[PDB]
Amino acid sequence: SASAVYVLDLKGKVLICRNYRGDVDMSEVEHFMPILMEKEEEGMLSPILAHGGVRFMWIKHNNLYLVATSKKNACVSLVFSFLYKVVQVFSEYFKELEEESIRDNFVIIYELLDELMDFGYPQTTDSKILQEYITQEAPRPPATVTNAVSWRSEGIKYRKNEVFLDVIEAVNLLVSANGNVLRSEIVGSIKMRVFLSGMPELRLGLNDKVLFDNTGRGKSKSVELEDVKFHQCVRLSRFENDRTISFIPPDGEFELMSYRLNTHVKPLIWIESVIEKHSHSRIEYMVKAKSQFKRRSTANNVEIHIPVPNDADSPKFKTTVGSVKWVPENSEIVWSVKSFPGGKEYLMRAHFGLPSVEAEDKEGKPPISVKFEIPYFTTSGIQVRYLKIIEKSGYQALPWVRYITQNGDYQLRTQ
């Protein structure tokens, strides 16, 4: 129940404001900047502010914080969802999120803001559907918004029917400084770029453990996805009944399902690092990386971030494979490896100086983060079984899908 959604700037200037209910005066935005400064300077800064009887709940974007005023006990989750939808719509319409487009695309921005939410209740949020009613360069609204199918515009015709899938894996490992991994979860990401003619009803079928058990094939490699988050086009009832993944794919790239299950296997990369930091004299980095992944897979663009001293200077790197560069902006040693064959072992011996005078305050121990991304590797073992592309007219589809394995929250706790 937001009262007025406004877009601010980095200097406190409101780039654009659009009141929806008017229950909050527009002058209350002036106290938002001082309130945010006080909260940040006292550690009380939060995404949801409070200017007396009016709360300013908003998030910070690339260049501005979208503050949406509210007065009643409105759904903060609803406000956050509306803000996320607005950010996605702006990103779809404008390739960049900065003040350069706010002051240049106001004509279409105002129309989009007026059409998106009325009286604090959003009604239309599909960027592809919204692009047919509001343009920056007006006919009747499309029937898709009024119709039940608001994610598949009718009348789409293409020369070919090719759908590109992307099974993106995120290897997140929370390894403590003692050497034990605490948070080791892998979240699947099935992003598909459907480009066909018409409104096909996709019939997704994979090697799920639950599906195999129900059908009686619970003996082969089946993915035990703890959480499966279907998209809007996917029918929740069909999945709830017999794990039937039936949905109408949209035109473009979108996320259909997002698997998320815990991981109990060995890490793909094992890093053994040592810290021979002398007391204001020198420092040693005996870092050894062991690739526990399969030898048939190669981790393209391996970036193991090793946090070096903040005041360290005159560093020397004695490694084996991969480019080692120290970034003063990040204050860490970037163990950059182009191609890392599975089972490879890289040994590094760091040596950097340190000032004699001790630092005034402690800087902490940032964790070591690996940026390995090995494509064509399905760690979870989940394989797509079939994709029932059915169209009323009748056509032969050519679906495609690729599996990409990367490291997510794969950080290693420092000692």
Binding site: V163, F164, L165, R203, G205, T215, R217, N300, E373, P375, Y376, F377, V384, R385, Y386, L387, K388, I389, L398, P399, W400, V401, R402, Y403, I404, T405, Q406
Partner: peptide
């Protein structure tokens, strides 16, 4: 080709499950 794994064609359904 494409970085991150070459795209592979997908099936239509579980032919072995009827």
């Amino acid at each position: 080709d494409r970085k991150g794994g070459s795209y592979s064609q997908a099936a239509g359904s579980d032919s072995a499950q009827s």
